[PDB]
Amino acid sequence: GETTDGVYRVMTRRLLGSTQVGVGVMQEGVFHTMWHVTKGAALRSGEGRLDPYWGDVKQDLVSYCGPWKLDAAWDGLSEVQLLAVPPGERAKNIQTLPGIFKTKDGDIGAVALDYPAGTSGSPILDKSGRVIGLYGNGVVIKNGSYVSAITQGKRE
């Protein structure tokens, strides 16, 4: 199937009609998404099949066809862009200055952007166009809004 670099919708026909369950990134022949989008299940790409290769529930990440390839990191200073791919709608770039998740094991960039469930896995980009993490694992805060970590894997 198609393996061109880019952003992809993750779809299913198990429910009524076709439903977008998430989003992911194809880079260097590897498909990258958030664990909770696929639960680590095999995927179809056209006539081909993508098998899971690496994943971790706690990081909430999974890669298909090879190891995690995305290694860019937020510089902690500059605005970034969410390349949001909402269900039934065209891909769109939203620019923002990340906040910070403060944890016992260090700080993580976080974006205060609120998109529906089907957009989990959408990439967050730096100004060079490199993917610095995926959108869709985060917190609901008091004001009802959603704040997503900038979740990035490790390239071995």
Partner 1 sequence: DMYIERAGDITWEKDAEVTGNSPRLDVALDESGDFSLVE
Ligand X SMILES: *C(=O)[C@H](CCCNC(=N)N)NC(=O)[C@H](CCCCN)NC(C)=O
Asked if 15 is part of the footprint of partner 1 (rule: CB under 8 A), the reply reads no
Q: Report yes or no: 11 and 19 within 8 Å, Cβ to Cβ.
A: yes
User: What value does the CA radius of gyration of the chain take, rounded to a whole number of Å?
Assistant: 15
Task: Find which of partner 1, ligand X, none residue 48 binds, CB within 5 to 8 Å per kind.
Answer: none
> Pick from 155, 122, 154: which is nearest to 137 by CA?
122
Q: Report yes or no: 136 and 123 within 8 Å, Cβ to Cβ.
A: no
Question: By C-beta, is 110 or 152 nearer to partner 1?
Answer: 110
Out of 62, 74, 98, 134, the residue judged to bind partner 1 by CB under 8 A: 98
Secondary structure class of 14 (helix, strand, coil): coil
Block residue for tokens 């985060």:
138
Q: Smallest distance from the beta carbon of 103 to partner 1, in angstroms?
A: 6
Long-range contacts of 136-145 (CB under 8 A, 24+ apart): 136/22, 136/34, 136/36, 136/37, 137/34, 137/36, 137/60, 138/110, 145/112, 145/114
Query: Binding residues for ligand X, per CB under 6 A?
Result: 22, 36, 60, 114-117, 119-120, 136-140, 146
Asked if 116 is part of the footprint of partner 1 (rule: CB under 8 A), the reply reads no
Out of 28, 29, 71, 95, the residue judged to bind partner 1 by CB under 8 A: 95
C-alpha span between 156 and 153 (Å, rounded): 10
Task: Find which of partner 1, ligand X, none residue 55 binds, CB within 5 to 8 Å per kind.
Answer: none
Q: Smallest distance from the beta carbon of 67 to partner 1, in angstroms?
A: 19
* Residue ranges binding partner 1 (CB under 8 A): 2, 4-14, 21, 23-27, 31, 35-36, 38, 41, 43-45, 50, 57-60, 79, 81, 83, 85, 90-105, 110-113, 123, 125-129, 131, 137-139, 141, 147, 149
